[PDB]
């Protein structure tokens, strides 16, 4: 009765958003304000802002009521 991890498929009605790690080497983070060293001392990485902006940009595009 073991456990297998499933990636929590939640269906966003929009174009695919690249993963948070595969996000600075696609070029996105060049166009996001760099996180300050103090901010980086916490959990903030300036790719959270990029990833949230991209997820809200593509959240519902392929969807009408």
């Amino acid at each position: 009765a073991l456990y297998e991890y499933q990636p929590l498929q939640i269906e966003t009605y929009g174009p695919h958003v690249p993963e948070l790690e595969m996000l600075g080497r696609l070029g996105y983070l060049n166009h996001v304000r760099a996180a300050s060293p103090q901010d980086l001392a916490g959990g903030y990485t300036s790719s959270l802002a990029c990833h949230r902006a991209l997820q809200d940009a593509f959240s519902g595009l392929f969807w009408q009521p």
């Binding site: 809200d56 940009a57 009521p65």
Partner: protein, 281 residues
């Protein structure tokens, strides 16, 4: 996230006809409520006059949230205006005056968003005497629960600004054909204000509103960005999805095209008739 939100589930309607149905139903409900309790008095407002007064008081809501002494973030203003739109989608202007509901929507948007403002500050942002500020605060607190009930306790509003920024990031990244997409930023701010003036917030997703603003700015500036839709969004293959998105964008652009701002004489007459309706309850 919008795709799971209550804004998608409940407050996103299929056509302007459904919006007009809801508003005419609210107006008719108030009219029948007034008639059945002690039958065609011209004191009442029509649904289109109610819409004119709603447009006027949404303009005044933008003006208030723009001169707010602490710099109100634009998400808070968008949330307050969305609350105004919904509240008067399902409620009649003659029951609840739009100035008090204007201030109440601003208040609840300041609280639901985490723009932390004390009540004395919030009423100090009102161009009334301190007695008038105290009374306005009393009315706001009276009407705050009513506003939250009339929103069906759906307090999270998704504004097109964050999808606008995310589209700009993706556009600077994967769309090298476009250089310096910030000219688009200025013109799309203009179009986004224009489109916030209309009822498109209840009809399209914030992502679609942001994309329409961006592509409208491109079209005004002579840029073609069909390669950003077909490619870089992979609408080259699901042609039906591409045409569906284009229809959404054309519909909402036309919706901004046909918007007629509230007048100056008509708004004066409507304000006077509304205050006569409120005085004689």
């Amino acid at each position: 996230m919008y795709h799971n939100s209550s804004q998608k589930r409940h407050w996103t309607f299929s056509s302007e006809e459904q919006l007009a149905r809801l508003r005419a139903d609210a107006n008719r409900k108030f009219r029948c409520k007034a008639v059945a309790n002690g039958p065609n008095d011209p004191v009442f407002l029509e649904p289109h006059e109610e819409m004119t007064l709603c447009k006027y008081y949404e303009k005044r809501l933008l003006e208030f949230c723009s001169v707010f002494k602490p710099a109100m973030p634009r998400s808070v203003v968008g949330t307050a205006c969305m609350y105004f739109k919904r509240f008067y989608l399902n409620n009649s202007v003659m029951e609840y005056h739009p100035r008090i509901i204007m201030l109440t929507c601003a208040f609840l948007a300041c609280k639901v968003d985490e723009f932390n403002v004390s009540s004395p500050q919030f009423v100090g942002n009102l161009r009334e005497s301190p007695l008038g500020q105290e009374k306005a605060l009393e009315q706001i607190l009276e009407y705050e629960l009513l506003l939250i009930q009339q929103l069906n306790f759906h307090l999270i509003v998704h504004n097109p600004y964050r999808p606008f920024e995310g589209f700009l990031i993706d556009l600077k990244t994967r769309y090298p054909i476009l250089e310096n997409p910030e000219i688009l930023r200025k013109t799309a701010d203009d179009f986004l204000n224009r489109i916030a003036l209309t009822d498109a917030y209840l009809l399209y997703t914030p992502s679609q509103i942001a994309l329409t603003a961006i592509l409208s700015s491109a079209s005004r500036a002579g840029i073609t960005m069909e390669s950003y839709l077909s490619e870089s969004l992979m609408l080259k293959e699901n042609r039906t999805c591409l045409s569906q998105l284009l229809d959404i964008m054309k519909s909402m652009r036309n919706l901004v095209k046909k918007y007629e701002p509230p007048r100056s004489e008509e708004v004066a007459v409507l304000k006077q008739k509304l205050e006569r309706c409120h005085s004689a309850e």
